[PDB]
Amino acid sequence: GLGYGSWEIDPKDLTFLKELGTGQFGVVKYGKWRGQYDVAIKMIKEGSMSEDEFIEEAKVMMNLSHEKLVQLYGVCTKQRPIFIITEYMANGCLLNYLREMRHRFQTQQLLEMCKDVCEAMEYLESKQFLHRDLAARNCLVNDQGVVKVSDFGLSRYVLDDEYTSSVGSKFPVRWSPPEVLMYSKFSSKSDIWAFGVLMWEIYSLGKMPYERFTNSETAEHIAQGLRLYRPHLASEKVYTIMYSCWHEKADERPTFKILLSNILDVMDEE
Numbered sequence: 001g002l003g004y005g006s007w008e009i010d011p012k013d014l015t016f017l018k019e020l021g022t023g024q025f026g027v028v029k030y031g032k033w034r035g036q037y038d039v040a041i042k043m044i045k046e047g048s049m050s051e052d053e054f055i056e057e058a059k060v061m062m063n064l065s066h067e068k069l070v071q072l073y074g075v076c077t078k079q080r081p082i083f084i085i086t087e088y089m090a091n092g093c094l095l096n097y098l099r100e101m102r103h104r105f106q107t108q109q110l111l112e113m114c115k116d117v118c119e120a121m122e123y124l125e126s127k128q129f130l131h132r133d134l135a136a137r138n139c140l141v142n143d144q145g146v147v148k149v150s151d152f153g154l155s156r157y158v159l160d161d162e163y164t165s166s167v168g169s170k171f172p173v174r175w176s177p178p179e180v181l182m183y184s185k186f187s188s189k190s191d192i193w194a195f196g197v198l199m200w201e202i203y204s205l206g207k208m209p210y211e212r213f214t215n216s217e218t219a220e221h222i223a224q225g226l227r228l229y230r231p232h233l234a235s236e237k238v239y240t241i242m243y244s245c246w247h248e249k250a251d252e253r254p255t256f257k258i259l260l261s262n263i264l265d266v267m268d269e270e
């Protein structure tokens with residue numbers, strides 16, 4: 001109502017029910033909006049984000065909507081800490097989900113997770129919207145087991161320099177192509193590279209990429225033209241798809257539309 005833009009939620013409409021996590025960028029809670037609608041609420045740690053820039057971008061993000069993309073419902077901007085209100089994903093972070101061996105996943109389930117992410121990324125690519133930090137840690141799983149992409153574009157607003165360039169301890173070296181590591185060349189094709197690493201994470205049940213190497217060793221490995229190798233659960237055709245994302249020449253990597261077609265082919269064949 002009065003006093004709130006279309007991107008703004010009145011925090012008085014929130015009922016906080018459970019804490020989900022705490023970390024460097026804040027606390028995340030599960031709650032309800034207007035008593036009925038499940039939401040996740042991220043409380044942004046003071047000093048961690050370029051908040052005015054994020055708020056302007058939130059207005060853009062409100063217009064992104066796809067069934068495999070975590071939905072932004074709004075932001076609470078009038079007080080501190082500010083809140084980001086989104087779709088609630090009851091089964092939590094994809095990385096944690098993959099690592100729970102009890103699930104005893106079939107490879108068909110793993111391929112479906114890859115397809116969910118690929119559909120979201122094809123949508124983002126169609127909107128010329130780069131994710132910039134695609135990885136299993138940035139995906140979520142709902143109570144039906146559907147994977148959705150989260151945190152899209154958020155890295156642009158992080159103030160901590162450990163996160164923000166290639167040298168930093170928190171930069172996603174293991175999800176980055178050579179041109180990012182060598183000269184900070186971000187593009188659609190750096191999201192493609194990261195997607196291949198994400199497929200590897202899925203088929204490896206959440207292992208760390210290049211688990212025996214440091215970040216510095218990883219950068220050297222990949223810049224020498226060497227790669228991850230085939231997870232045991234990936235068929236030859238699945239491995240071909242993820243490996244295609246890692247061409248040294250960015251322009252020789254597929255688009256998300258092509259990847260989606262290839263994933264659907266494998267689903268039909270296997």
Ligand SMILES: O=C(c1ccc(Oc2ccccc2)cc1Cl)c1c[nH]c2ncnc(N[C@@H]3CC[C@@H](CO)OC3)c12
Nearest residue numbers: 020021028040041042084087088089092093151152154
């Ligand atoms: O973490 C967010 C979230 C992400 C980005 C965002 O902001 C953005 C989203 C998209 C683009 C840019 C920013 C907001 C929010 Cl609230 C969640 C959104 N829905 C959720 N449902 C369940 N759990 C969630 N988080 C926990 C946190 C603890 C973790 C421990 O393993 O497990 C998953 C979330």
